[PDB]
């Protein structure tokens, strides 16, 4: 019964690569992490930093979440991330994605004890 923290790791963590290795990165990853199961997940971001560094964001800059909640935090430093965006030619079950690497600050929502990331809110 996958916890919210575990789901965050599956959907957004990829410390294996330092950046978007290939143009087919998203196509493979979105499928590998089961984000193309029930449908082609429109957009998803992967963070290429250590889990410790990502979890540490929960003790960083407190900012408002997009839904109005106040438990979001923005990283003090930029982080290596890869944004995956569904193409127009993409048709389930053959989900196609556009891979885009970048260095941006991330914003995550944190909850629980231990206080850890449970939702990826944005990249800035």
UniProtKB/Swiss-Prot annotation:
Residues that coordinate or bind substrate: 7, 10, 41-45, 66, 85
Catalytic activity: an [RNA] containing cytidine + H2O = an [RNA]-3'-cytidine-3'-phosphate + a 5'-hydroxy-ribonucleotide-3'-[RNA]; an [RNA] containing uridine + H2O = an [RNA]-3'-uridine-3'-phosphate + a 5'-hydroxy-ribonucleotide-3'-[RNA]
Localisation: Secreted
Endoplasmic reticulum in keyword set: no
Alphabetical GO biological process terms: defense response to Gram-positive bacterium
Molecular-function GO terms, alphabetical: lyase activity; nucleic acid binding; ribonuclease A activity; RNA nuclease activity
EC code(s) of this entry: 4.6.1.18
Main location: secreted
Enzyme class: lyase
Glycosylation sites: 1, 7, 34, 37, 41
Residues of the active site: 12 (proton acceptor), 119 (proton donor)
Tissue specificity annotation: Pancreas.
Domain of life: Eukaryota
GO cellular component, as recorded: extracellular region
Disulfides per UniProt: 26-84, 40-95, 58-110, 65-72
Family: Belongs to the pancreatic ribonuclease family.
Function: Endonuclease that catalyzes the cleavage of RNA on the 3' side of pyrimidine nucleotides. Acts on single-stranded and double-stranded RNA.
Assembly behavior: Interacts with and forms tight 1:1 complexes with RNH1. Dimerization of two such complexes may occur. Interaction with RNH1 inhibits this protein. Monomer.
Name listed for the protein in its UniProt record: Ribonuclease pancreatic
Source organism (scientific name): Bos taurus (Bovine)
Lineage: Eukaryota, Metazoa, Chordata, Craniata, Vertebrata
First-to-last residue of the parent protein present: 27 to 150 of 150
